[PDB]
UniProtKB/Swiss-Prot annotation, chain B:
This is Hercynylcysteine sulfoxide lyase. It catalyses: S-(hercyn-2-yl)-L-cysteine S-oxide + AH2 + H(+) = ergothioneine + pyruvate + A + NH4(+). Belongs to the class-V pyridoxal-phosphate-dependent aminotransferase family. EgtE subfamily. It comes from Neurospora crassa (strain ATCC 24698 / 74-OR23-1A / CBS 708.71 / DSM 1257 / FGSC 987). It holds the Pfam family Aminotran_5. One of its GO terms (molecular function) is hercynylcysteine sulfoxide lyase activity (ergothioneine-forming). It is found in: Cytoplasm; Nucleus. Transmembrane segments: none annotated. Its EC number is 4.4.1.-.
């Protein structure tokens, strides 16, 4: 029968017992059963290299493609595997052929993952200005209607400057801070305005319902290794058949390229010699999650729930607040952001006006000078690793640090109490100027 | 205390299926048992403390592998980084180059180029929309070194006669199919004299032949550690001299290290170029970490690179010559004896393909003479017998031998290694002879 969740599930994983994984959403981890699968695939790869790697790779790729396509409730013809979410997003932006008039614009939000945003910057440089970008700023906690309105106005203004909004990079769950993004509304608007919806769902599969067929996005990428208990280096690349021809070359270009089972799927099977063992394990992690655990719906339910209550406890212990909007839609995933009980001094080169609510929430709190903000940032990262044997990423947003905690099926309420008491002591020592 | 002897006694150090005979190490390579344990040891550390290890020990272990591989190559440590594979590195070069605005730049390559690399040229032409073109140089094998150099000089000179500008050249160290040593020293020197970017595909390189990087001083060099350096699959070393590192604007894929054009405080640290390759998307970097362990294992246990390379190249010639003797044919070699300057050999199979009048090949007299009396296969059935030989070699004989179809002849490519010996090539001759006798009897059908 399926196992109970919580710390008893640590028996099934291979984490250091002295280390506490409060940041699963960054690199993920795999249970013992999947680690043994991974090494089994490598053993077979080294036993008979050419026979296995040439002819058993496509069989094992298809078995993982079928298992993950059925998880997403999409046709198996629309899914392939790539190294990671960065590789997949690069595969989209590097393949798009932009309009000859040079009016195309890429729309994105300032919460974009750094590597993705820097991919937009390079693509613009590589294409020699045939395409430009429009950065949409977001203030968190962000109401869902305000995000939509910020997207519609960026579309409107882009046309008023004689530009053509061509493609938008849309998050399912954003990275920093870790919040559920209203991607359903943004992709729908991309349809209405004929904008390519490039959905960065790296924080996606295994954690939240992606609603692929319902949302019908032009492209979707999601990290199996983040929240599907898949070995590191595995992202699922979703492309509907209508758009597969736009992916002219894989990344990198390999034997499957055609100069001017479908050809799109066959192209991704061999893209240079790699260890494909993470890809092969996808089918095993899905079956492991369904047989050993209660299944996808039971897993996601526990994590998002633990994320709301765990963060709320951390907020109580710290005397602050979780990051959430009025509709309670930011914490619709396994990650939650809690403000730290201090404030950073204003930066003279880029002063940030605070709303009345934000400035009210910081009085009585210790203030760090802005010149020491980066110094305090490093000190907190080092201390959490060396003295507390954990890691907590922190988003610097509007003169405040928001700690991101990741719930998991092997965590429980006591873990978020420890995180609350840990961060509390950490911030008390920051208040005493221990970072110097 | 001495280094371990070579041959089948060395198989106990590897993890090959004892029933499987690996005559094709040059395609995917393999690793000794000790290195596979290192790979899994790095995996365990990654899952024990993911964030502390993957963020802060990754650059440390990369730096140890970079220093270890730089000393083997005898290059400055700042000129080497690690990328996923050879198909990743050549792409990194061809996609970062900024082509002349006038549209006269063209890329010159030989028709023995690796298939993925050739199509990488085709796509970059398509992606960059005709502002760069390509010029393919056909090669006839066995090719004399002077003739290769001659065709390169003729294509450069010709190139300019159509108002084009030869800008970059893709140059092999050891070509894939057929597996032969290429005169890259001459071609790279000619690229400097003619001001052409030398992009050296040395995937068949490190661990097998002396790359002579400092002597060659190429513009870009790439080589697969997982092919001939006993490194786990998914590892190629990317060599760029500091003078050319600014030309690599973005890694593949683009990641946090990319700096947009249009202040600093670098201090005296790792260069931006080297830092850029440390995090280019989340991957299992365990193969990269094992580079220092593989190089050390080869030095301590096997006696070093020179002893390893010298045995494999000697076994290639003599082993290949016995396969040719058993088959009654020949090895692929020119008058200069420089093709078999590696651990791979090509031996012609004792039959000939019927001529295809779609692309009829005009053979020399030495091809007329050497095919006289041999059983001829009709050209309809060349591909049919090609696939049938592959399946039988795997299903009946439990091995794999890749074959180049070149000028109405098949050349089986064999790979020598430290765990193989003379008896293995005798088995290859016996197997290939039994295989070709059954092809003459038309068993493929």
């Amino acid at each position: 029968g399926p196992l109970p969740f919580g710390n008893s599930l640590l028996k099934e994983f291979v984490l250091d017992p002295a280390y506490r994984n409060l940041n699963h959403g960054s690199f993920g981890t795999i249970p013992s059963a999947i680690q043994q699968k991974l090494r089994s695939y490598q053993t077979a790869a080294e036993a008979r290299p050419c026979p296995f790697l040439r002819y058993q790779t496509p069989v094992l790729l298809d078995e993982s493609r079928a298992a993950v396509a059925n998880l997403l409730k999409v046709p198996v013809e629309t899914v392939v595997f790539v190294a990671n979410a960065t590789m997949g997003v690069n595969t989209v932006l590097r393949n798009i052929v932009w309009s000859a008039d040079g009016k195309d614009e890429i729309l994105y939000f300032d919460t974009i993952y750094g590597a993705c945003g820097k991919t937009i910057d390079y693509v613009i440089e590589d294409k020699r200005g045939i395409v430009s970008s429009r950065c949409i700023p977001l203030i968190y906690p962000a109401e869902d209607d305000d995000v939509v309105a910020a997207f519609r106005d960026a579309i409107k203004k882009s046309r008023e400057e004689g530009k053509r909004p061509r493609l938008a990079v849309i998050d399912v769950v954003s990275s920093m801070p870790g919040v559920r993004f209203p991607f359903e509304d943004i992709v729908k608007i991309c349809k209405e305005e004929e904008i390519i919806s490039c959905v960065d769902g790296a924080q996606g599969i295994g954690m939240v319902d992606l609603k692929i067929t319902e949302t019908d996005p032009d492209f979707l990428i999601s990290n199996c290794h983040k929240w599907l208990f898949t070995p590191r280096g595995c992202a699922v690349f979703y492309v509907p058949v209508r758009n597969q021809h736009l992916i002219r070359s894989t990344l990198p270009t390999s034997h499957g390229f055609v100069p001017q089972k479908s050809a799109f799927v066959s192209n991704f099977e061999f893209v240079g010699t790699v260890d494909n063992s993470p890809f092969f394990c996808v089918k095993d992690a899905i079956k492991w999650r369904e047989e050993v655990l209660g299944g996808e719906e039971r897993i996601m339910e526990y994590m998002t729930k633990l994320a709301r209550e765990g963060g709320q406890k951390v907020a109580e212990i710290l005397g602050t607040r979780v990051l959430e909007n009025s509709t309670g839609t930011l914490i619709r995933c396994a990650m939650v952001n809690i403000a730290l009980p201090f404030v950073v001094g204003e930066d003279p080169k880029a002063p940030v006006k605070l709303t009345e609510k934000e400035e009210k929430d910081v009085e009585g709190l210790y203030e760090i000078p802005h010149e020491e903000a980066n110094m305090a940032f490093k000190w907190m990262y080092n201390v959490l690793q060396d003295e507390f044997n954990t890691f907590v990423p922190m988003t610097f947003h509007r003169r405040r640090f928001w700690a991101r905690l990741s719930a998991q099926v092997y965590l429980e309420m006591s873990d978020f109490e420890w995180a609350g008491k840990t961060l509390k002591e950490l911030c008390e020592r920051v208040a005493k100027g221990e970072y110097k």
